Amino acid sequence: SGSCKGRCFELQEVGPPDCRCDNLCKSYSSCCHDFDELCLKTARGWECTKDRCGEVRNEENACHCSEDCLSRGDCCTNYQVVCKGESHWVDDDCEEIKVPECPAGFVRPPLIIFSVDGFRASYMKKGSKVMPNIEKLRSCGTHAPYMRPVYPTKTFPNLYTLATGLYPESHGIVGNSMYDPVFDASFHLRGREKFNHRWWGGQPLWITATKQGVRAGTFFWSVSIPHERRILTILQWLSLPDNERPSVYAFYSEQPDFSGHKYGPFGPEMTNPLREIDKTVGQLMDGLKQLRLHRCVNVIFVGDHGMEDVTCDRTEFLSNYLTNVDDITLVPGTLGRIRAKSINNSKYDPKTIIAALTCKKPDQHFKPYMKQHLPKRLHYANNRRIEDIHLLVDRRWHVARKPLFQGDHGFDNKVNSMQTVFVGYGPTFKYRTKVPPFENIELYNVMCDLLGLKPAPNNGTHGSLNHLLRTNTFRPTMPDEVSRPNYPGIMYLQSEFDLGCTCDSTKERHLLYGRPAVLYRTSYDILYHTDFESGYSEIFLMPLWTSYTISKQAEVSSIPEHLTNCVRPDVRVSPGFSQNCLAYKNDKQMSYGFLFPPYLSSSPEAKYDAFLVTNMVPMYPAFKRVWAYFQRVLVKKYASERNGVNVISGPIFDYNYDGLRDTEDEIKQYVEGSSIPVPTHYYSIITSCLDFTQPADKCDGPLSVSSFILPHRPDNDESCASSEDESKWVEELMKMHTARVRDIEHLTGLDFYRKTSRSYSEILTLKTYLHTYE
Ligand SMILES: *[C@@H]1O[C@H](CO)[C@@H](O[C@@H]2O[C@H](CO)[C@@H](O[C@@H]3O[C@H](CO[C@H]4O[C@H](CO[C@H]5O[C@H](CO)[C@@H](O)[C@H](O)[C@@H]5O[C@H]5O[C@H](CO)[C@@H](O)[C@H](O)[C@@H]5O)[C@@H](O)[C@H](O[C@H]5O[C@H](CO)[C@@H](O)[C@H](O)[C@@H]5O[C@H]5O[C@H](CO)[C@@H](O)[C@H](O)[C@@H]5O)[C@@H]4O)[C@@H](O)[C@H](O[C@H]4O[C@H](CO)[C@@H](O)[C@H](O)[C@@H]4O)[C@@H]3O)[C@H](O)[C@H]2NC(C)=O)[C@H](O)[C@H]1NC(C)=O
Ligand SMILES: C[C@H](CCC(=O)N[C@@H]1CCN(C(=O)OCc2cc(Cl)cc(Cl)c2)C1)[C@H]1CC[C@H]2[C@@H]3[C@@H](O)C[C@@H]4C[C@H](O)CC[C@]4(C)[C@H]3CC[C@]12C
Ligand SMILES: CCCCCCCC/C=C/CCCCCCCC(=O)OC[C@@H](O)COP(=O)(O)O
Ligand SMILES: [Ca+2]
Ligand code: NA
Ligand code: NA
Ligand SMILES: [Zn+2]
Ligand SMILES: [Zn+2]
Questions:
Q1: Of 181, 362, 422, 513, which is the most exposed, with the fewest CB atoms less than 10 Å away?
Q2: In sequence order, what E strands does 184-278 have?
Q3: Which residues bind Ca(2+)?
Q4: Cβ distance 95 to 427 under 8 Å?
Q5: Phi and psi at residue 196, to the nearest 5°
Q6: Which residues line ligand 1 (CB under 6 A)?
């Protein structure tokens, strides 16, 4: 417990018992007694003035304007501008940085991450009027229209996703507040508990760097260190000798979130907070220019989430729905999480709670879900810290337990107001380049590539952001197919089938982008037909995928009356590896549907192919209403609008809600007295030509995709308008359950788009794309 002299913001760890002088010492109440005195000098502010140029060095000043300051590494960021007639970085023209211009001794371009809390993507519209430095970074660098945060759209899940490339369910920081039933402890911004490493999973970038010999401190700063001091400390660290200097740095600003919450996102009061951020950015760049590192360093300007208009009057109370609200604990606000108030309560029943919250009031501004029924695109279920009951709250509303600020965030990560920013500037990024919106889970890989690091396993798709960089150290390669398909001929007689059923240029046309590869061990059959092709699993007794193409002027027919209950045995597949219709009769709850729609057959003769037992899938009657509407009405609609479409459809089994393809052992439900497994979800991937004037089967250029993962539910309680015509609700339900192709690949162990005219990086970008319907 001595002194900090010569050790301010030192990069080593010290003690215990010895006192600390590092940038987190205040957070551990461990700074040496003279830390405030030596290390947090504030005298005379942060800006040089003409008066002070060539002053005699006074050790009391926050920063210096003396002739030695540049030797000493501690000039104010504007010193050269005020005293040498240099220009502020923002006043110089954009000049493309073809190669890193670094001082001798630098082995890689440093990375600086400048994260802003609550920075809404639409704030970039306010432009160089308010934020000339940010606008310049955006303009001369690489930028997206916006970047998608993860759900929940709160700070800590997003900050730690940025650093790990992991979903909150994987990294463990699933909210700003959490309860962990195994630890029997709670995590909050206020508390000792957040300091235990046990909450923090994955491998953040600082650890990835350090384990691979790249110097990198933890990204957190003690909040009591002012913004200007942090910037000066980063600058001083960048002046260190080669053997002590870090290659990655982080700055966090709590603005403009703090003002967003008070005044709302569209308040006139937001201008000054944004001017203040921009001034801090200006300090960093001016400082970098002072050190001749301004064409050496890569800078990421990134937000964690946006901000919405939310007032106290738009609050739903659970007391208006639940007779007994004091038996529950609620994590409230822009999402809901419900659990039992006490584990001692044995009458506590989740099903009664869900029923009592489901579709009661006409305007109802939240929706309850068991977490395994949340849209799969959220990836918000596979963690014991996420409560079984979840409430999705409508944008602009809160939920609270009982009745006894005007901006908020935390909503569904596809909501517009939740979108945030991304700008990359420096030698490794492209120059003056706009890139499409992408998800913040993808940045960890990029940051690894900017630092020559091997990423730890994460949820980014490595290579899908290659188009952001001038130089790509990572070239992705298609995974090798693991199981090769069988091609069964006509073997069996119809008399060999005891299934209890009764009835009264394929590849080039129907697999436009090639055959999906199966990336796990299994046994499956390719089945060709006039209107569609399929990969039929002999283990699961149904298609893994079914693929077909519908031209712009293809025609919809009905299932004629006499084939209504038609299921025909498939002579290419053995009785032993087929479904049977007897199981469906014996299952009172379960009906069946088809993957290729009989509705879209090319002829009445081809229509018979649709009724094969090998095109059949278990479907709840409730779900058939959704599925029939998609197949009969929507598929044709999309083919019209997009000038034909290619459709790949299939089952998903995810009983343990981990976003990954279930093994047989992990399947928990079968059609009554059979071993026909019941899917948890059904997917479709719908592809066409981005240029819609070119039809889907003759496309020269980029592709356009939209997909979904529909949950396979025995009721339509999710849809509060489901007692009406399907035209009133199925499509809204589908859009809620929009998905990336990549989500489907994880859920099915399939790899799509193996045969295209496009680069594989471009295909990785196609597979990460999400159609949000915003
Ligand atoms: C998003 O991307 C994720 C990352 O790839 C995917 O998540 C992974 O999923 C797999 C498959 O389900 C899962 O694998 C299981 O792992 C069990 C062991 O779990 C512990 O160890 C791992 C490994 O830690 C090291 O590697 C990870 C990356 O995975 C890295 O981030 C770590 O820092 C650590 O790094 C060190 O080692 C590596 C080399 O291994 C070095 O390269 C590196 O330099 C480091 O030195 C940890 O990930 C686990 O972490 C979980 O649990 C802890 C403790 O509770 C949590 O704090 C943490 O948040 C995390 O929790 C999440 O995952 C668990 C499941 O693991 C969930 O229950 C939970 O809700 C959270 O979501 C553990 O510390 C292993 O026993 C198990 O083995 C079984 O299957 C195999 C199959 O071969 C069989 O052989 C056996 O019979 C077993 O039955 C299985 O292998 C990974 O753990 C998991 N990783 C992460 C980070 O979550 C995710 O699926 C993907 N999502 C989607 C939708 O695609
Ligand atoms: C949870 C606290 C931090 C409290 C806080 O609200 N800090 C604010 C908001 C963001 N801040 C910040 O500087 O953010 C930088 C940042 C940027 C980006 Cl892009 C991503 C990320 Cl993730 C962060 C200023 C912190 C303080 C100390 C932390 C612990 C470490 O001292 C030791 C280890 C390090 C391991 O990697 C993780 C576990 C560990 C115990 C840390 C847990 C989190 C602690 C307690
Ligand atoms: C070598 C000495 C070993 C350590 C001695 C520890 C002394 C025992 C006291 C423990 C409680 C607090 C000490 C550790 C963390 C200090 C907490 C702190 O200073 O931050 C409070 C935090 O909520 C503020 O939340 P926000 O400001 O809202 O982020
Ligand atoms: Ca699974
Ligand atoms: Na039935
Ligand atoms: Na309903
Ligand atoms: Zn935040
Ligand atoms: Zn906030």
A1: 362
A2: 185-187, 248-256
A3: 654, 656, 658, 660, 662
A4: no
A5: -75, 125
A6: 166-167, 169-172, 201-203, 211, 379, 382-383, 456-459, 659-660, 746
Q: Are 312 and 425 in contact (CB under 8 A)?
A: no
Q: What whole-number distance in Å separates Cα of residue 326 and Cα of residue 348?
A: 11
CA distance 116 to 138: 15
Active-site residue, 218 included: no
Residue nearest atom 3 in ligand 2 by C-alpha distance: 220
Q: Which two tokens stand for residue 430?
A: 């492209």
Residue nearest to atom 9 of ligand 1 (CA): 170
Q: How far is CA 549 from the centre of its chain?
A: 30
| Secondary structure (DSSP) of 446-493 | HHHHHTT--PPS-SS-TTTTGGGBSS-S----PPPP-BPPB---S---
**Residue from 643, 617, 614, 613 nearest 631 by CA:** 617
| Three-point CA angle 385, 390, 393, nearest 5° | 130
Q: Find the Cα–Cα–Cα–Cα dihedral 7, 8, 12, 16, rounded to 10°.
A: 80
Solved with: X-ray
Left (φ > 0), alpha (ψ -120 to 50) or beta: where does 66 sit? beta
Helix, strand, coil share (%) of the chain residues, nearest 5 = 30, 20, 50
Nearest-atom number in ligand 3 for the CA of 188 is 23
94-123 burial string, b = 16+ CB within 10 Å, else e?
Answer: eeebeebebeeebebbbbbbbbbbbbbbbb
> For tokens 């719908």, what's the residue?
686
Q: Whose CA is nearest to atom 69 of ligand 1?
A: 383
**In angstroms, what is the span from residue 682 Cα to ligand 4's centroid?**
14
Whose tokens are 């040498």? That residue is 84
* Top CATH class, 494-768: alpha beta
Query: 36: annotated binding-site residue?
Result: no
Angle between helices 155-164 and 443-450 (to 10 degrees): 40
Q: Report how far apart, in Å, the C-alpha atoms of 744 and of each of 333, 366, 592, 654 are.
A: 31, 27, 22, 11
Q: Tell me how far apart the alpha carbons of residues 348 and 342 are, in angstroms, rounded to a whole number.
A: 9
213 lines ligand 3 (CB under 6 A): no
E strand residue ranges, 210-332: 248-256, 298-303, 308-309, 315-317, 328-331
3-state helix/strand/coil string of 311-380: CCCCEEEHHHCCCCHHHEEEECECEEEEEECCCCCCCCCHHHHHHHHCCCCCCCCEEEEEHHHCCHHHCC
Longest dimension (CA), the chain: 104
State the Cα–Cα distance between residues 110 and 105, nearest whole angstrom.
12
Q: Give the active site residue among 153, 155, 208, 614.
A: 155
Ligand nearest to the CA of 197: 2
Q: Is the CB of 29 under 6 A from ligand 3?
A: yes
The DSSP annotation for 530-560 comes to: SS-EEEEETTTTEEEEEEEEE-TT-------
Contact call for residues 587 and 671 (beta carbons, < 8 A): yes
| Residue 409 annotated as lining a ligand binding site | yes
**Matching residue, tokens 């509407």:** 629
Of 162, 134, 245, 765, nearest to 448 by C-alpha is: 162
Here the tokens at position 184 are 């029997």
